[PDB]
């Protein structure tokens, strides 16, 4: 019950509309958590909640306390954190609850509670920069003598979330003009109003605002200093919102005075808490009790809208100070490292400038990580250019302790822009212009082939087809990249559309050995339980039916009983094709297999320098068969108005199309190719509830591909599966928070010894060194 | 039919003699491709052989090219090497059908045709000195964490076979007199008519020579620059014969100049040939398109020579050639492939010579470490025994540079006539090699951390592994500390190869860790070494003799295989009075007290010189002479003995004994032969001795069909190839003889884990850790000092 009352839009409405005089806001305050309670968990039926509020309440007088921040982050603190060797812990049966907890509340304020009504022994040092972790001597160890591995970790913006709330307090325009910049557009609007309907730009920058002027109010009394006297005038945490405060009619600002130069940092924050908090520890004002309680809920409600978002100033805020610190986040606490090999996937940008000076700055980062630990001579103290980075970096050796760092950019992808002699063109022509730089500045300085590694596209698959870049992928490879994944991500309609799209990646892009897959759910979630929630009626487009039609009668033409499925979807097919192309003649299952198979080649080689090779290389490779009509039947469904048009319209699918045990054949037929082609799969976070069809983390996919028992369905092939943490969905997260997260549920939810448990989980891990980009 | 066209004894005689202006020879050479098949593979079907040809012929016409090695190896080229991250590398699907083609096809050309056909991405900077491995990160990453650990090399010769042509180029009169000396030799001989019977030491300098001067023939191709106008006298391949064309009458000579100081390096073939090749990337002028039809043929003829005589040029090839054998070993990275190697060598009797290279040994491997380990050593240049040493002792192991453990190897020899015992001149020589050994490590005793095995790896039938007794025994008091024996990879009937190991494992003074060389006889399958045989074996009376009573000592044990104990019991007497002629009984517990004496040295006092003797001045010997001694003198009982000194020095024994004698092939049934190898499973794995396993890819058994069927998926316990009852042993990995043309162990462990994902349907988690516990059986049985 606590997540409700310091996380809900309603609050914030309910308390900073309200002015500071009145104290008697129980009622109000309950009102809003039940009310927020409706919407962030139905199911939980009224009786439970009613109970479960009441129980709360009597804690809080029990201890002689008052309803406020102060007194709910106590017993958060105090049910979840709890002092262990290492320091301040979580309690290992209550991660599973702590993790529910950072996908809506922000950690930093508890952790701060827990060190001012809780503190380490022996007074040790103790500095906040990492999420905190549970223990166990089983995993730490293991962490210690092998180091963990990273496949996924988003360089660009923030290395967490939490720091980015305190980020957008240093910028409060530059980061409403990007705020404003997403809201013209739709998406941003429904997101926005999604989370709350009652935010707009101008709630947005009041909101930030607000929480500003309330940090150095909050500062002042935390630093012991006397009140600026305007308090009289402090009566509705409104009239913060315009950073200019009058009393007696003269100008009174906000800005205050802070004994540590950064007032914008972790440590700063966090000083500023226990300071705050220790001075409250026997008495609290509501009248200053209230505006904490603002700053918390707008911090909570600020963290869970940008996380969500993922699903110019700001960009390069520090630019050189940004990419630093996360290696030293990711090398953590200690002398050595907890991660070993960690991929920095990266946004390549369309100016070439732009991209030079960020892979400068990636690498001119890297470079100060290693200037502290590794010791010795370099060729330049001050590189300041690309070429003096590789002139440092290339006296370093594999010492397993350093993070190591494998760049590898991933492409882009929008809404598929029609016309252009093919519906995806202008965003080949964005992508090929953006593989342009990558390959001259690969071409002009050779050293770089050892750091960028790979090439990735992450950012949807209804627009682009997983086919359109096979002549991206084939064109690098001969530049010299050496590595190619491919981030399917799981937004498909059908979950028989999803096998298709993991089937085309597989057959069509040129995935040599050791490559990598990300996000492969569609091969994971039982579709027992995928059906959940999902009405017996399901919309997909006219194309995509199609190919998933045919794509089912490629793969179930050999199971005995799973024949007359191949056989109705191939008739069914055959039929649909008619509909589509419009023609009047006899058109073949068999035929249909051939103009498909022709979707590797490039629609402008379809008509017909590194390039223009290409070009020709599927050209003559169209002209070795008598394969004439397949080629002009995929012209025509390339270069044909009707056909386009038709591609587009929505047919009607039933839920229960295929039945279960059909499914999990077209999963098992993938998931053999899957393995025998040995491609890994990029797993992301369990804390990244967004499935929707998950009631738990015990239920995730991920335990089918392990293989224990009562998950893995009978006939499944073992396959290789990588780690990775690029969207976890909480506000701090970490691989060895996750790692730790996957190693509980073992435990837990299925009983497992530790010894045994950490060596499955330790399979996994493993995997992610196994298939990694990095050179030997 | 791809690995005709460039390993063929007639199509090199069809082509020499045939001028180079005449271009029409395609149906010369398709006639001499279908001989030469038939004469490689006998067991190919003609109309298979034919569809094959014709295949190539008509896929040449589609490409549009020539017949010829400009077009034969574009077709290998895009068949078996493919492009990836590391580089060229060959596909895992025909990894095997490329070890195959291997010993055949020298690969370095295969890589010139490859890279200028098929370069590598953005033009990346490619070092070629080591053999294309196939690529799997399951396996690639092992090697990584965990090095290979690497058991039997000879570092006597070079790394592998392709650069030792380059070394037959450079020594012209050298190998010329290599082979002479060798052709003076009946075995030679018969080996090199085996090969071609058109084959005689004046044409053997011919042939060399031919390739000598086709190589700077098309180097002036390959350099671009124009021919030097004495082509217009140039008629046949004949000519190239003398080094010498005359055109009008003027002087003129093939030999030109490199742009490379070191024309015979590796560099300088392979940029030769990268550039010669690219400069047919169209087209080929006929004349020169043969020619180099025939350096290839040449090229392969000697790799061929060279593989098959290995199964002067030793003392010039044995400096500093170690260095480049380490970083061969090496390879590419930071960190060395391999971490334990234990690089074997032929000893020498004379001190001065057997120091001289045990130096250049322990100074090549410094300089390795030089190149690498970037620390300041005691001496800069050591260029002595002792500042070697001194220098060596100041680096520690950490699982990055190569470390190596010196193991010198006996060679066995012919038993000579007379001298009242059967090997006395070959004893005399070991007891004299050993002697220089043991005095010399006693002259600088730190090398006992460096020289730590002694091996014999010459044949079986020669010497009996018993004979080695004495002679290791000493070596033990003198500081050596680990024995290995290679034994039992030959043997003239299984069932008397089975005797051979156990007469290793009862008499040999092996110790709990030491190792075992090629242990054949344990591994083949009696139905799999039954293919092909003639329905009755020969093999000598007294191989037979020392048969007949080994089986009855681990039959007669057996509950249900009594019948061929009894048997063998009562025949090995009547054998033992057609051997000793003796006219009174012996019984066969006789027959085995006398049979276990055979391990004492034939000099021990008491045995076979006077028993009243003055005491030799306490040697290293003097143990072993008086142990034999008194033991014998000792538990009451001298009737063995007697009937052993006849078994020594008995002017008709010794001759009954090399009587030959005829066994049938199935004498002992499937199962029984198996019974006999469980139980030299148990004894062994007791003693705890690990067996070096030969590469894979050395087709010397000549009894497997494929690679699938090699006895070291029995010893391991692959389902489907292991034999109930087998008691699995320890097997560390070695590379010494892989009768292919340029190999690795990096290699020889690919084709193992590809055998068991392919043939056996292993996954790649599972396969990596069958073949990764034999790569760390060289490290659990390691003959290096801790």
């Given at each position: 019950m606590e997540r409700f009352l310091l996380n809900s839009t309603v609050l914030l409405y309910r308390l900073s509309t309200?002015?500071?005089?009145?104290?008697?806001?129980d009622e109000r305050v309950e009102s809003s958590v039940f009310l927020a309670q409706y919407e962030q968990a139905?199911?939980?039926p009224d009786h439970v909640a009613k109970s479960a509020w009441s129980y709360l309440v009597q804690q809080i007088k029990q201890r002689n306390m008052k309803l406020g921040p102060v007194a709910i982050l106590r017993l958060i603190a105090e049910k979840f954190i709890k002092n262990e060797k290492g320091g301040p812990k979580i309690d290992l049966p209550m991660f599973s609850e702590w993790q529910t907890l950072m996908s809506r509340v922000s950690c930093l304020p508890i952790i701060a509670c827990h060190q001012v009504f809780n503190p380490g022994p022996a007074s040790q040092e103790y500095s906040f920069r990492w999420p905190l972790y549970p223990y166990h001597p089983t995993v730490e160890d293991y962490i210690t003598r092998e180091c963990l591995h990273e496949t996924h970790?988003?360089?660009?913006?923030?290395?967490?979330?939490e720091e980015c709330w305190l980020d957008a307090l240093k910028h409060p325009e530059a980061c409403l003009r990007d705020f404003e910049k997403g809201w013209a557009s739709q998406e941003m609007k429904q997101l926005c109003a999604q989370i709350?309907?009652?935010?707009?730009p101008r709630i947005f920058k009041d909101r930030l605002q607000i929480a500003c002027n309330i940090r150095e109010i909050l500062c002042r009394v935390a630093q012991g200093v006397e009140l600026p006297e305007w308090i009289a005038s402090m009566?509705?945490?409104?009239?913060?919102?315009?950073s200019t405060i009058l009393h007696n009619g003269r100008e009174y600002g906000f800005a205050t005075v802070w004994?540590?130069?950064?007032?914008?940092?972790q440590e700063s924050e966090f000083c500023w808490l226990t300071g705050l908090l220790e001075k409250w520890r026997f008495n609290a004002p509501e009248g200053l009790e209230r505006l904490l309680w603002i700053y918390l809920l707008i911090q909570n409600q600020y963290l869970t809208l940008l996380v969500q978002r993922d699903d110019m100033t700001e960009l390069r805020e520090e630019t050189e100070k940004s990419y630093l610190s996360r290696f030293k986040h990711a090398h953590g606490?200690?002398?050595?490292?907890?991660?070993?090999y960690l991929e920095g996937r990266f946004a390549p940008k369309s100016d070439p400038n732009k991209m030079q000076k960020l892979l400068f700055s990636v690498l001119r980062g890297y470079w100060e990580y290693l200037s502290?630990?590794?010791?010795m001579e370099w060729?330049?103290?001050?590189?300041?250019?690309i070429s003096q980075v590789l002139d440092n970096l290339?006296?370093?050796?594999?010492?397993?302790k350093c993070v190591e760092l494998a760049l590898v950019p991933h492409f882009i992808k929008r809404k598929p822009k029609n016309g252009?002699?093919?519906?995806?063109a202008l965003l080949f022509k964005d992508l090929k212009n953006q593989a342009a730089i990558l390959m001259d500045m690969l071409k002009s300085e050779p050293r770089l082939t050892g750091w960028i590694r790979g090439v990735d596209a992450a950012a949807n698959e209804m627009h682009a087809?997983?086919?359109?870049f096979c002549p991206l992928f084939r064109v690098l490879a001969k530049s010299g990249i050496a590595h190619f994944t491919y981030h399917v991500g799981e937004d498909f309609p059908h979950l028989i559309s999803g096998i298709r799209s993991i089937d085309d990646a597989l057959r069509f892009?040129?995935?040599?050995?050791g490559d990598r897959l990300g996000h492969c759910t569609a091969i994971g979630i039982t579709p027992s339980i995928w059906?959940?929630?999902?009405?017996?009626s399901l919309s997909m487009t006219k194309e995509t039916r199609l190919l998933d039609l045919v794509f089912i009668w490629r793969e179930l033409r050999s199971h005995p009983e799973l024949l007359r499925y191949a056989s109705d979807a191939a008739i069914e097919a055959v039929r649909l094709a008619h509909k589509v192309f419009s023609l009047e003649e006899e058109v073949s299952i068999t035929t249909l297999d051939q103009v498909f198979e022709?979707?590797?080649?490039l629609a402008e080689s379809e008509g017909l320098s590194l390039w223009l090779e290409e070009y020709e290389r599927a050209r003559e490779l169209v002209k070795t068969t008598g394969m004439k009509r397949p080629l002009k039947l995929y012209k025509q469904w390339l270069t044909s108005d009707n056909v386009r048009k038709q591609r587009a319209e929505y047919v009607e699918v039933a839920?229960?199309?295929?039945p279960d045990e059909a499914v999990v054949a077209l999963q098992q037929a993938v998931m053999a190719k899957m393995a025998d082609r040995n491609i890994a799969i990029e797993c992301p976070p369990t804390?990244?509830?967004?499935?929707?069809?998950?009631?738990?983390?015990?239920?995730?996919h991920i335990f089918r591909w392990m293989g224990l028992p009562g998950e893995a369905i009978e006939g499944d092939v073992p396959m290789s599966i990588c780690l990775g943490s690029?969207?976890?969905?909480?506000?701090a997260a970490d691989l060895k928070s996750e790692f730790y997260h996957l190693f509980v549920v073992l435990t837990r939810?299925?009983?497992?010894s530790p010894a045994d448990a950490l060596r499955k989980v330790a399979e996994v891990n493993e995997n992610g060194r196994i298939y990694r980009f990095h050179d030997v």
């Open positions: 309200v002015s500071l005089d009145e104290v008697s806001l139905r199911s939980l970790q988003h360089l660009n913006g923030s290395t967490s979330a709350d309907p009652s935010l707009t009566q509705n945490p409104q009239q913060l919102a315009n004994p540590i130069d950064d007032k914008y940092s606490a200690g002398v050595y490292s907890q991660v070993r502290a630990h590794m010791s060729v330049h103290e001050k590189p300041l250019t290339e006296l370093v050796e594999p010492h397993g252009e002699a093919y519906p995806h087809p997983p086919e359109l892009l040129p995935l040599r050995n059906k959940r929630s999902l009405p017996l022709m979707r590797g080649l839920l229960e199309y295929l804390s990244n509830t967004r499935i929707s069809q998950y009631r738990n983390v015990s239920e995730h690029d969207d976890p969905g909480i506000f939810k299925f009983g497992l």
